[PDB]
Amino acid sequence: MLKLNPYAKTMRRNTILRQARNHKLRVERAAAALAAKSD
Amino acid sequence: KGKPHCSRNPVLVRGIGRYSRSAMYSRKALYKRKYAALATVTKPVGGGTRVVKLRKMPRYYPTEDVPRKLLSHGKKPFSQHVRKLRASITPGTILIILTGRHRGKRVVFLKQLSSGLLLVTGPLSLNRVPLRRTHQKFVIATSTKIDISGVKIPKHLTDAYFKKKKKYEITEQRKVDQKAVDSQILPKIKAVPQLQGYLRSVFALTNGVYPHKLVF
Amino acid sequence: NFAELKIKRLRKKFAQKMLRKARRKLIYEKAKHYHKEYRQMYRTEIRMARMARKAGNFYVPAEPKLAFVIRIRGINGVSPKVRKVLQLLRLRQIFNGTFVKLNKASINMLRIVEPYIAWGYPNLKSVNELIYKRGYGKINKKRIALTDNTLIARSLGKYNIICMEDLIHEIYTVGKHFKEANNFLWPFKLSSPRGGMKKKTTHFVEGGDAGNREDQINRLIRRMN
Amino acid sequence: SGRLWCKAIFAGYKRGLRNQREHTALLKIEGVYARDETEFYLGKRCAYVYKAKNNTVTPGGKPNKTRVIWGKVTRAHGNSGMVRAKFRSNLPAKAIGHRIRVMLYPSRI
Amino acid sequence: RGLR
RNA sequence: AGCGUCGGGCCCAUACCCGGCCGUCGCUGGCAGUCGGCAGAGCGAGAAAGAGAGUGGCGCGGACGCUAC
RNA sequence: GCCACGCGUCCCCCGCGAGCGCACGGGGUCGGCGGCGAUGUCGGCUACCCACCCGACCCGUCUUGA
RNA sequence: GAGGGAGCGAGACCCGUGCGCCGCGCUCUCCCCCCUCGGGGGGGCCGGGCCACCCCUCCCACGGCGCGAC
Ligand SMILES: [Mg+2]
Ligand SMILES: [Mg+2]
Ligand SMILES: [Mg+2]
Ligand SMILES: [Mg+2]
Ligand SMILES: [Mg+2]
Ligand SMILES: [Mg+2]
Ligand SMILES: [Mg+2]
Ligand SMILES: [Mg+2]
């Protein structure tokens, strides 16, 4: 795919970092939910 | 002159770096790193001296030759291959050695070797089964592990140790290896109740028992 | 001598190396600029809506420039007025596909053969899948595979069409040089539909597959590819 | 020291109404009646056994009369626990309604 | 030459 | 296991797809370049054309090949 | 986060650096293995007979139609 | 799992080697530091725009409202 269209490195390099960061936020919201009911 | 450093950019996925080449020019620090710009042998004789040749052309040629072959690229050999392993099989787990003349027996795993074949030992005392190799593909993983972490089993044993030659007599060294691993493990298996009975016992199917259906 | 010639031959290869690199960097920059383009195109069509509803009116979007046609039935016993049209659209085999720019002239023919085809308005991903996976150019009257850009530059360099991406751009934006871009493409040999078909004979509205099924063509492509 | 294989019956070949493509074979395994269930057996080595008049070799032993045709469970067939299987040589129709020993030892676990 |  | 309205799932044709093989047609395609101590082994590449003359400033070596009906 | 990095000169405003490895890369390889055997055993498509499963109306001809 | 002579290099001061085109990119030819047990693994090494937060307001597009003009 790169031999034909090389920009795919950046297009598939992003959309990974994005997802990991957003996964961190999902977990942070769950722990803060436990903090809100407990506190 | 410089010792070889590791790859600077980490691996996220096979063949894709984490960082971009523009941050990389910096990290490598290219801003301050620009550049610009036998066959004949002499020998003595008891005459003169003879200048002999090495690697002389062959005295006979054959009647016809096969041609050259093309360069394929990705085909590494077996020694150099990477060796996989299932999640179930960790050292300690109990295996069902299904196929060989030692059929359906229950036996403890020690270690994957370089080749990828499994080191297995159905305690010779109990099962009458020595240190034997097997293959993963022909083996069931039970969920009944034990904490085998603390023994310093010898390094010397290996694939070439188990490799066939071409009568078989049992070596004293073989007897030592068996005895040496036994003295270490046997109390842990005799500590847990009924388990030595289970090990002496052999696995075997019977009526109304279907592998897909049941679970273990 | 074979001294000065060696050094000269090295300069010639070095020049052609730098040239190939430069074409590579150029290619990259066209593609990133088109990503920015597509993103903009998609957002604005919503923004027009939100603001329209705020005022209380209705936003009517533009008519679709492009349609993706598929022949669903076979070669036996077909009216000759049809056959002529069909072979003008290059639909000689069953489960063959073609792109078609729209206008009164084309749409009246597709009306005349409604029962034999299934068409609609295809999405961008479907265009990628089709071109990339099954791209085969008509080069010197020969069905040759679209595996390197050289094969394109030789033929279409005169329209500044150097790569798969520019091709895509023209297709989705039905630009100037559609005729040449499509006539370059060999009729798409699509396979039989995974999952199945509802009923070959009848129109969509009476529960069939023929005729205009605007967007559901994408679902059908995913089942056929 | 016991039964180390699941039972299956050779129901018939792959076939339409008036044509049978006998290079493929249909198994009906005992106690399995759903496509969920047949995902276990995938990949497994089947083995049709038979016995013949004259004495033949036997690997690891003296020559027996028994012989074998090895095979392989290809993929599921149908919705009610039937299953396709492709044997290395094509099967005889005599065997219709008989036993085949599906083994276990290409495990998928 | 600028690379130099 | 009938009648009417419908869902998922599922079955196979010498039809469709991917791959192997035979023959024919088309490209009026390519190949006489096996140019060897008179040698230096390329001319598939996005862009009309030249690996062009000159003149001032030790060891003796290198596979197949082409009945051109 | 960036396929952004001599100096001098030009514009708008403030033609030769070499070196070494990895591989989803112009069509599969192992530099990996195991069993049987000199008088009853191995291979032997075709061709000899028998069995089973499915398929299957006797040829030539005139004929719109066998 | 069809196919089977792709050549790399060194150059008329040599005569080799058969991992070679296209394509992705690691280290050394800079210098320091850090961690797990000489080997293995890390942090990096300085300049410049851009967008990131907050204060100001220019050009075009489209929509709405108001005053005014034809
Ligand atoms: Mg299906
Ligand atoms: Mg019948
Ligand atoms: Mg028996
Ligand atoms: Mg068929
Ligand atoms: Mg084909
Ligand atoms: Mg007659
Ligand atoms: Mg007649
Ligand atoms: Mg008559």
Cβ neighbours of residue B24 closer than 8 Å, sequence gap 6 or more? B8, B9, B17
Q: Are C207 and C170 in contact (CB under 8 A)?
A: no
Whole-angstrom CA distances from B82 to B30, B65, B85, B91, C134 are: 35, 37, 10, 19, 34
Q: CB B16 to CB A13 under 8 A?
A: yes
Pairing of strands B94-97, B105-112: antiparallel
List, in sequence order, the alpha helices (H) in B84-168. 159-162
HSE of C158, CA atoms in CB hemisphere, 13 A:
4
User: DSSP for C21-50?
Assistant: HHHHHHHHHHHHHHHHHHHHHHHHHHHHHH
Residues 6+ apart with CB under 8 A from C168: C127, C128, C131
Q: Under DSSP, is residue D32 helix (H, G, I), strand (E, B) or coil?
A: coil
User: Cα C26 to the chain's mean position, in Å?
Assistant: 23
| CA torsion, ordered B149, B150, B152, B158, to nearest 10 deg | -20
Instruction: Give me the phi and psi of C212, to 5 degrees please.
Output: -75, 115
Which stretches does DSSP call E strand in chain B? 11-13, 16-17, 40-44, 49-53, 94-97, 105-112, 118-121, 131-134, 139-141
What is the CA C33 to C1' F45 distance in angstroms?
Answer: 29
* Of B137, B206, B212, Cβ closest to residue D3: B206
SS3 D64: strand
Integer-rounded Cα Rg, in Å, for chain E is 3
CA distances (Å), B73 to each of A3, B14, B67, C34, in order? 17, 18, 19, 35
- Under 8 Å between Cβ of C96 and C70: yes
D10 by Cβ neighbours in 10 Å (0-12 / 13-18 / 19+) ranks as: buried
CB C126 within 8 A of CB C218: yes
Q: How many residues does chain E have?
A: 4
Q: Which experimental method was this entry solved with?
A: cryo-EM
Contacts of E2 by beta carbon, 8 Å cutoff, 6+ apart: none
Residue type, B181: V
In this structure, how many other beta carbons lie within 10 angstroms of the beta carbon of residue C149? 20
Distances (CA, A) of B161 to B82, B113, B114, B158, B174: 21, 11, 12, 5, 10
**CA nearest neighbour of D108 among D58, D39, D59:** D39
Tell me, rounded to whole angstroms, the distance of Cα B29 from its chain centroid.
Answer: 40
List the beta bridge partners of residue C143: C138
Q: Report how far residue C146's alpha carbon sits from residue D60's, in angstroms, rounded to the nearest whole number.
A: 57
Q: What is the resolution of this structure in A?
A: 4.1
Structure tokens at B140: 């069931």
Residues B136 and C55: their CA atoms lie apart, in Å, by: 70
Q: How many CB atoms lie within 10 A of CB C128?
A: 13
Which tokens in the block code for residue C17? 């190396």
Contact, C128 vs C168, CB < 8 A?
yes
Report how far residue A39's alpha carbon sits from residue A31's, in angstroms, rounded to the nearest whole number: 12
> In chain E, count of helices (H) and strands (E)?
0, 0
- Report the chain B residue with the minimal C-alpha distance to residue A9: B16
Specify the DSSP element, H or E, that contains C224: helix C217-224
Place of tokens 């993983």: B141
Tell me the H-state helices in chain B: 21-28, 159-162, 172-191, 195-200
Interhelix angle for C124-134 vs C217-224, to 10°? 30
Joined tokens for residue B207: 């009526």
The type of residue at B157 is L
What torsion, rounded to 10 degrees, do the Cα atoms B13, B16, B22, B28 define?
80
Kindly state whether B36 is in contact with chain E, defined as any CB-CB distance less than 8 angstroms. Answer: yes
- SS3 annotation, chain D: CCECCEEEEEEEEEEECCEEEEEEEEEEECCCCCCCHHHCCCCCCCEEEEEEEEEECCCCCCCEEEEEEEEECCCEECCCCEEEEEECCCCCHHHCCCEEEECCCCCCC
How far does residue D19's CA lie from ligand 2's centre (Å)?
A: 9
Amino acid at the residue B123: P
Task: Find chains touching chain D: ≥3 CB pairs under 8 Å.
Answer: B
- According to DSSP, the residues that pair with C99 across neighbouring strands are C68
Nearest residue to nucleotide H15, by CA–C1' distance, is B39
Query: Which amino acid is it at C186?
Result: W
